[PDB]
Design a protein that fits this description.
By secondary structure, the protein is α/β, with parallel strands linked by helices. It has 2 domains: about 1-265 and about 480-504, Rossmann fold; about 270-480, 3-Layer(aba) Sandwich (Rossmann fold). Helix content is about 35%, strand content about 20%. The protein contains 15 helices and 18 strands. The strands form 3 sheets. The protein has a 9-stranded mixed beta sheet, sandwiched between helices. It has a 6-stranded parallel beta sheet with strand order 15-14-13-16-17-18, with helices on both faces. It has a 3-stranded antiparallel beta sheet with strand order 8-10-9. Strand 14 (about 340-345), helix 10 (about 350-365) and strand 15 (about 370) form a beta-alpha-beta unit. The longest helix is centred in the first third of the chain and has 18 residues, at about 105-125. The protein starts with 10 loop residues before the first strand and ends in a 6-residue tail after the last helix. Keywords: Amyloplast, Chloroplast, Glycosyltransferase, Plastid, Starch biosynthesis, Transferase, Transit peptide. Belongs to the glycosyltransferase 1 family. Bacterial/plant glycogen synthase subfamily.
């Protein structure tokens, strides 16, 4: 096939608390497709023996006994090969419960997960041979955060796993896997390792008169011991990161500045391509943009807007959630309709805000449209029809709207930092080889900064069409596939392998 392969194929072990496919969870499948040997280790969250969801995940005949939590606990391994990925399931009674979610014994459950994941590459003879000890472990969030500690504490000091590295992937900073320090001995690690998991809360965060504020912090433990770190917080300001995860964690992260990278995602270009999109009235490409103008006209018509080519048309799309930046838009609208623009937002999931969409539309009956509900066909047409797409997300680990916008020559305006390494590089008409960038990223997340950026983009749209055309063409020519994404992670792993295991 035409499927691109990787220079250096590797053995890669994903560890995760999530259940098996997933919108942003195709990384494993993509890597596998590039010739890597790819394992994903997860809990078997079983719903009865004959649960259809695990019907094809067969028992491997392998079990281990994990010494921890005042005793010795056994897990077993189930396995399925699917999409060139080894899906390995860790089985214990405590996973059989109607996901994450919130239970007193979580710390225990995910401790099991982590010990198990360290054994799998050493004992499972998948397709006849084990994965062995030159693995890249990709551990996701706090659920898998003890893995890099185990490698460093239990294996490497004895000559095991010295040629393996680990990458911590951080989708959020809210849930750090925190429990009281009195639980440290339950983890079955040696005493000297306490410092890696040790976490003391500042005095203003104490909870009762005698609270010493002493804890263990899974995520913190990984941040301290992982080799590379891929984090949501990369494309955001100090202030935002501090608000999401606390100042303590933020300083810790920035203390490991040299090994940080942002999350990189891909999109399905069979679904998202302006040249073939079945959902669009007209098709277009980077070479011929005439079709996009027709889409806009056809979109204004569908929405009942004045059919004006010259007016800036702006889109928002997604769930009516707090995290999506909903309330910012609510506040900026009035100041925004002072200008000659049209604004359509499509989304659903909040009757009071939905109600607000309706009244707003009524107040600005020639400028604002609120499409309440969802519709993938309508979202495709909005993406194609609009000139600008607005993503005021607070802390987005899975920012796909950018990519769709860019893929479609729709210029994104998004909350965040806009450096060259960022998913949206802020527009800058100056530089060796003139104009650069793909849209506008603004920070911090404020009604003022947002409107400023909107106005900045709107001006560019009206007064410098030739510059605008460049912003679009740059977006559309970018590679937003998973191959491109996997290529990035591949680079990262190479850096990890080339360097010494961080924790010496």
């Amino acid at each position: 096939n035409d499927q691109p392969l990787a220079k250096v194929t590797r053995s890669i072990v994903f560890v995760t608390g999530e259940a098996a496919p997933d919108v942003c969870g195709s990384l494993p499948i993509a890597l596998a497709a590039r010739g890597h040997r790819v394992m994903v280790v997860m809990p078997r969250y079983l719903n009865g023996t004959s649960d259809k969801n695990y019907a094809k995940a067969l028992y491997t005949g392998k079990h281990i006994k994990i010494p921890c939590f005042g005793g010795s606990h056994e897990v077993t391994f189930f396995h399925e090969y699917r999409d060139n990925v080894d899906w390995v399931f860790v089985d214990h009674p405590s996973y059989h419960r109607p996901n994450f979610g919130a239970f007193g014994d979580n710390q225990f459950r995910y401790t099991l997960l982590c010990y198990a994941a360290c054994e799998a590459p050493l004992i499972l003879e998948l397709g006849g041979y084990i994965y062995g000890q030159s693995c890249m472990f990709v551990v996701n969030d706090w659920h898998a955060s003890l893995v890099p500690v185990l490698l460093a504490a239990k294996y490497r000091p004895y000559g095991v796993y010295r040629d393996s590295r680990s990458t911590l992937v951080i989708h959020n900073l809210a849930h750090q896997g925190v429990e009281p320090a009195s639980t440290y001995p339950d983890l079955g690690l040696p005493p000297e390792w306490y410092g890696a998991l040790e976490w003391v809360f500042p005095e203003w965060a104490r909870r009762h008169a005698l609270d010493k504020g002493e804890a263990v912090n899974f995520l913190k433990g990984a941040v301290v011991t992982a080799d590379r770190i891929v984090t949501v917080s990369q494309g955001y300001s100090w202030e935002v990161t501090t608000a999401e995860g606390g100042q303590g964690l933020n300083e810790l992260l920035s203390s490991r500045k040299s090994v940080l990278n942002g999350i990189v995602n891909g999109i399905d270009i069979n679904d998202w391509n302006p040249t073939t999109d079945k959902c669009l009235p007209h098709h277009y490409s980077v070479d011929d943009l005439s079709g996009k103008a027709k889409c806009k006209a056809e979109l204004q018509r569908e929405l009942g807007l004045p059919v004006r080519e010259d007016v800036p048309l702006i889109g928002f799309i997604g769930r009516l959630d707090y995290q999506k930046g909903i309330d910012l838009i609510k506040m900026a609208i009035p100041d925004l309709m002072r200008e000659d623009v049209q604004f359509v937002m499509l989304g659903s999931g909040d009757p009071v805000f939905e109600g607000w969409m309706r009244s707003t539309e009524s107040s600005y009956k020639d400028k604002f449209r609120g499409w309440v509900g969802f519709s993938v066909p309508v979202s495709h047409r909005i993406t194609a029809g609009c000139d600008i797409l607005l993503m005021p997300s607070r802390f987005e680990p899975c920012g796909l709207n950018q990519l769709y916008a860019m893929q479609y020559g729709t210029v994104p305006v998004v909350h965040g930092t806009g450096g060259l390494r960022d998913t949206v590089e802020t527009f800058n008409p100056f530089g060796a080889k003139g104009e650069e960038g793909t849209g506008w990223a603004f920070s911090p997340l404020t009604v003022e900064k947002m409107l400023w950026a909107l106005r900045t983009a709107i001006s560019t749209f009206r007064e410098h069409k030739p510059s605008w055309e460049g912003l679009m063409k740059r977006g559309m020519t970018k590679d937003h596939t998973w191959d491109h994404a996997a290529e990035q992670y591949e680079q990262i792993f190479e850096w990890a392998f080339v360097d010494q295991p961080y924790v010496m």
